[PDB]
Amino acid sequence: EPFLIGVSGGTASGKSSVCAKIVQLLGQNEVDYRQKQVVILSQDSFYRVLTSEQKAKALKGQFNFDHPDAFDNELILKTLKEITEGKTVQIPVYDFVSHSRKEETVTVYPADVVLFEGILAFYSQEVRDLFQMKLFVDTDADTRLSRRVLRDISERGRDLEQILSQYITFVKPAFEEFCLPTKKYADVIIPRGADNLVAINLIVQHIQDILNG
Amino acid sequence: GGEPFLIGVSGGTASGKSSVCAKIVQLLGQNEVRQKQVVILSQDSFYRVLTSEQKAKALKGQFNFDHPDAFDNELILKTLKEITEGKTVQIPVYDFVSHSRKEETVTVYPADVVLFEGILAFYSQEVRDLFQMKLFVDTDADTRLSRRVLRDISERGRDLEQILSQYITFVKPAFEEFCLPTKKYADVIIPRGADNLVAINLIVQHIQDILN
Amino acid sequence: EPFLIGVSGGTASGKSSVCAKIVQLLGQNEVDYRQKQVVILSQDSFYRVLTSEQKAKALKGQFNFDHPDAFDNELILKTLKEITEGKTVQIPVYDFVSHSRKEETVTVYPADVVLFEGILAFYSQEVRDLFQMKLFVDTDADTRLSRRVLRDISERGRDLEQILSQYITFVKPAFEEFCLPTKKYADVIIPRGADNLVAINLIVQHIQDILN
Amino acid sequence: EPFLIGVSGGTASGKSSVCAKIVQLLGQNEVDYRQKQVVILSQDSFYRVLTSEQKAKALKGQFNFDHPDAFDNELILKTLKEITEGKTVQIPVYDFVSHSRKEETVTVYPADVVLFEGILAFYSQEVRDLFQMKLFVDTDADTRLSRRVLRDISERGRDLEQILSQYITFVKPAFEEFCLPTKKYADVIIPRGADNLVAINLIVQHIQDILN
Ligand SMILES: O=C(CSc1nc2c(cnn2-c2ccc(F)cc2)c(=O)[nH]1)Nc1ccc(Br)cc1
Ligand SMILES: O=C(CSc1nc2c(cnn2-c2ccc(F)cc2)c(=O)[nH]1)Nc1ccc(Br)cc1
């Protein structure tokens, strides 16, 4: 049975780079995709195929993609279950023009350890109860917001007003209502994110031992 | 201005604390006045005159204007004591170009209500014991950072990376160490800032009652 | 139209005693029952009449009376709407033996000012939209727990193990899940409770100005 | 050189039970004192010898043993730098009558891993910089007071009003002003405490890895 690590934290907490760094340090980027012992899954792969009335809100730009409802809880639960039972799985690739899933999927061969990472990884009891270990990457919201702003201006061509409109109207309230109340389910809290080498090495070491048990 | 009623106002940068003070005095028409019964004092007037070592620091972005050390606590305590005793006082006018006070001082005559506003208004016990009412304008750090970034870009012409580098290195550590722990000393907390018209009307109504 | 003030806070915040002290400082204990210009309603008077399955849970000490499910929001809504229409209204008296309402109701005549006070006074949009002013009495959970333990040994006949088991299992999670998030709806936050005479005198003076 | 783990968190966070459990799961409770590879040091062992002035405050129940000033940072620093140099060390044992150190000491032979555990283990930069790993046991203040009351009420036998007056007056203010600001120096935060078996087993394993 594969070892499931759930990782949560708000946007730009560093939950993504933490998963990236752990997997890099375990030599997994030098390993072919068919033979990887440690795989990373993101909750944002499992965005819902939107209905007519949902797609209408999304064109008007008034659909909160950080709300639990924007996420396909039942496909997440189904898929993680299959992973647990040792089965290989298909991860969707999301089209934001059509708010539907493309035909091309991503294949995920049975792994020894699976990192499942997202803003609402711990929101559903049934999904929480599949994780052997729960990690929350705790970064102050002001810190996270500065990171969000530099990232979205630099590697995307997004405008500063639009970024802070979306943050204040949608991201912040959804973080406070749905994500932050899930911090209390975490086994281990990792402050600051990917620059926290002591916490990362501690989780790398732990996965390393698992790969040799 | 027999025995002024001193109101202390704190809260982080971009909390709303200046606008709240400004709206309170506006809604009282004590705006456009010569017999001002309500005046606003700002802790921003009481910056220390800098050494040339410190002036040199300020030219680079590396002098912490959010630290207690950057404000003249002795002159603030003295100025507020004289106000409490019903005396006319001189407020400095600070020139940032020279990092020193001009000859021009602003004359504040005994008012019936004095609103003293600053990030560190409640930091010193001697100063905080002169306030008969202490207000804290409580606004979330991410909200406050959003307002600060937009003001610094759009009014003040700042570089984005410099704003946020300075935020992380100096402003945030200074707010968490020195300002945020003073919130417990507040009698009343005003969430959000200048848009809190219910909070603001409660403070204008209360100021009119003691003007009578 | 009566002026409606909603008042929330965790258990042992001091919301009850803040209300009680505001009324008494107004002189409204020396005013006659039918002539009360300012009255206090408690969300407590409006516990639901429990189902059979809820009765069962309650008798085994497994029903959370701090959950929104415990409160009769429809009756709360109805009674506040009628008070805004200037009606005389009847308030239920709850009985914890039967988990139901006594025949005895309590009569409240039209007041100028109504204080409504409860852990979940701001939980429901339609109820919170009836308040002209929302006060949240903000007292640290460790402080409030200190008060609860001393209150429950003296008043009730309870031991530490029962008070703390109940607090950890029921009061705390319900407070964090349901009460704490409503704080963002307050217009004014009152730290500490009824020893905050500056905050209390402020609400008193505001209420006096309504009565004039 | 030996591996120094610093552990902090508020009174009754569980940091002491976390250290006990880690050592119990590594089989060190069986190993002979002279051959122990993992040892727990407590900051509580390094209380300062009080001056007459402080001894005077302490007799009147006014010396705050949770204030940084109550810890002998110089002795802590010396003792940990010695452990780091491979040297055998004596740990004081304290008398809370004379507010000074007994005849008897406790000998600690060079260990491969030291857990240094206390409320202010990260307060001093010099102490904090010795630790290759910093753990902070984060337990809610209302939860910690719960445990503290039950623990203290017997283990010492003392009165309930005294435990709670002491907590509100001394412990809570000292935790909020001095301990809580040290959380940002933790590499890893362990929630709830000794019942967190995932977090405990993660640390046990890391230490086993180090001993092999
Ligand atoms: O001041 C701080 C940073 S804690 C903090 N609180 C925030 C931020 C943004 N919004 N809020 C906030 C939101 C809703 C509220 F209702 C209250 C605050 C933020 O960046 N940091 N110190 C701190 C750091 C870690 C811990 Br754990 C606790 C306090
Ligand atoms: O006590 C407080 C704020 S109010 C508060 N919140 C608490 C306490 C204990 N647990 N929580 C809590 C835990 C999880 C939640 F989701 C919500 C609440 C507490 O004593 N006070 N902090 C404080 C006060 C003064 C200073 Br100075 C610094 C920090």
C-alpha A141 to ligand 1 mean position (Å): 7
Q: Which of helix, strand or coil describes residue A135?
A: strand
The token pair at A24 is 């890099």
One-letter amino acid of B76: I
- Residues with Cβ within 8 Å of A131's Cβ and at least 6 positions away in sequence, in order, are A4, A5, A6, A116, A121
| Residue B35 contacts residue B208 (beta carbons within 8 Å) | no
- Reference D129, options D68, D81, D197, D61; nearest CA is D81
Q: What 8-state DSSP symbol labels residue A71?
A: B
For this entry, resolution in Å reads 2.4
Q: What share of chain C is helix, strand, coil (3-state, %, to 5)?
A: 45, 20, 35
- The neighbours of chain C, by the rule of 3 or more Cβ pairs under 8 Å, are A, B, D
Q: Provide the β-strand partners of residue A39.
A: A114
B4: left (phi over 0), alpha (psi -120 to 50) or beta: beta
- Reference A137, options A115, A154, A155; nearest CA is A115
d(CA B6, CA D36): 64
**Which domain does D146 fall in, by range?**
1-212
Q: Which of helix, strand or coil describes residue D47?
A: strand
d(CA D93, CA D80): 16
Residue C34 CA, chain-centre distance (Å), reads 22
Q: Is C176 in the pocket of ligand 2 (CB under 6 A)?
A: yes
Distances (CA, A) of A185 to A7, A83, A171, A181, D95: 11, 22, 21, 9, 42
Q: Which residues of A touch B15 (CB under 8 A)?
A: none
Measure the CA angle with vertex C54, ends C48 and C56; round to 5°.
Answer: 135
Q: Which of helix, strand or coil describes residue A134?
A: strand
| Residue C38 contacts residue C117 (beta carbons within 8 Å) | no
d(CA A110, CA B96): 64
Distances (CA, A) of B64 to B161, B166, D48: 17, 9, 35
Q: Which residues of C touch A176 (CB under 8 A)?
A: 181
Query: Within a 10 A sphere around the Cβ of A54, how many other Cβ atoms?
Result: 14
d(CA D204, CA D193): 14
| Residue B209 contacts residue C205 (beta carbons within 8 Å) | yes
DSSP B41-65: EEGGGGBPPPPHHHHHHHHTT---T
- Reference A107, options A44, A29, A34, A27; nearest CA is A34
The token pair at C22 is 């505001």
C-beta atoms of B167 and A140 within 8 A: no
**Could you say which of D184, D188, D191 has the minimum Cβ distance to residue A198?**
D188
C-beta atoms of A160 and B145 within 8 A: no
The strand pair at D133-138 and D188-191 is best described as parallel
Q: Element (H or E) spanning B38, and its range?
A: strand B38-42
d(CA D7, CA D137): 7
d(CA D52, CA B94): 47
Q: Is C140 in the pocket of ligand 2 (CB under 6 A)?
A: yes
- Residues with Cβ within 8 Å of C51's Cβ and at least 6 positions away in sequence, in order, are none
Q: What is the separation, in whole angstroms, between the first and last Cα of chain B? A: 13
Query: Within a 10 A sphere around the Cβ of B129, how many other Cβ atoms?
Result: 9
The token pair at C47 is 């516990």
Of all protein residues, the one whose alpha carbon is nearest to atom 4 of ligand 2 is C140
Query: Within a 10 A sphere around the Cβ of B65, how many other Cβ atoms?
Result: 16
The token pair at D174 is 């000292």
DSSP C58-102: HHTT---TTSGGGB-HHHHHHHHHHHHTT--EEEEEEETTTTEEE
CA distance to partner chain D, nearest, from residue A15 (Å): 14
d(CA A166, CA A61): 9
C-beta atoms of A149 and B160 within 8 A: yes
- The neighbours of chain B, by the rule of 3 or more Cβ pairs under 8 Å, are A, C, D
One-letter amino acid of D176: E
DSSP C147-205: HHHHHHHHSS---HHHHHHHIIIIIHHHIIIIIGGGGGG-SEEEESSTT-HHHHHHHHH
The token pair at B12 is 């982080």
**Breaks in chain B after (C-N > 2.5 angstroms):** 33
The token pair at C82 is 């009628």
Pocket test for ligand 2, best of D142, D146, D172, D182 (most atoms within 8 A of CB): D142
Q: Element (H or E) spanning A142, and its range?
A: helix A141-154
- Counting every residue written for chain B, the total comes to 212
Q: What 8-state DSSP symbol labels residue D124?
A: S
Distances (CA, A) of D64 to D45, D104, D121, D166, D179: 16, 25, 17, 9, 14
**Breaks in chain C after (C-N > 2.5 angstroms):** none
- Residues with Cβ within 8 Å of A26's Cβ and at least 6 positions away in sequence, in order, are A37, A38, A204, A207, A208, A211
Angle between helices A15-25 and A197-210 (to 10 degrees): 50
Q: What is the separation, in whole angstroms, between the first and last Cα of chain C? A: 14
Q: Which of helix, strand or coil describes residue A23?
A: helix
Q: Is D146 in the pocket of ligand 2 (CB under 6 A)?
A: no
Pocket test for ligand 1, best of B136, B139, B140, B192 (most atoms within 8 A of CB): B140
The experimental technique used to determine this model is X-ray
| Residue C163 contacts residue C153 (beta carbons within 8 Å) | yes
d(CA D104, CA B108): 67
Q: Element (H or E) spanning C198, and its range?
A: helix C197-210
| Residue B109 contacts residue B36 (beta carbons within 8 Å) | yes
Q: Which of helix, strand or coil describes residue C177?
A: helix
CA distance to partner chain B, nearest, from residue D176 (Å): 8
d(CA A182, CA D53): 48
Rounded to the nearest 5°, which phi and psi values hold at A188? -140, 130
Handedness of CA C14, C19, C22, C24 (dihedral sign): negative
Q: Whose structure tokens read 């004014």?
A: C188
Rounded to the nearest 5°, which phi and psi values hold at C134? -115, 110
Q: Whose structure tokens read 């008969």?
A: B132
Nearest-Cα residue of chain A relative to residue D5: A198
Q: Which of helix, strand or coil describes residue D125?
A: helix
Rounded to the nearest 5°, which phi and psi values hold at A35? -120, 5
Query: Within a 10 A sphere around the Cβ of B51, how many other Cβ atoms?
Result: 10
- Reference B150, options B167, B136, B138, B137; nearest CA is B167
- Residues with Cβ within 8 Å of A91's Cβ and at least 6 positions away in sequence, in order, are A41, A45, A46, A79, A105, A106, A107, A108
Q: Which residues of D touch A133 (CB under 8 A)?
A: 198, 202
C-alpha D8 to ligand 2 mean position (Å): 18
Domain count within chain D: 1
C-beta atoms of D167 and C142 within 8 A: yes
- Residues with Cβ within 8 Å of A53's Cβ and at least 6 positions away in sequence, in order, are none
The strand pair at D89-91 and D106-108 is best described as antiparallel
| Residue B165 contacts residue C177 (beta carbons within 8 Å) | no
Q: Whose structure tokens read 């006014």?
A: D62
Which of C206, C207, C210, C211 best tests the B interface by mutation, with the highest count of B CBs <10 A?
C206
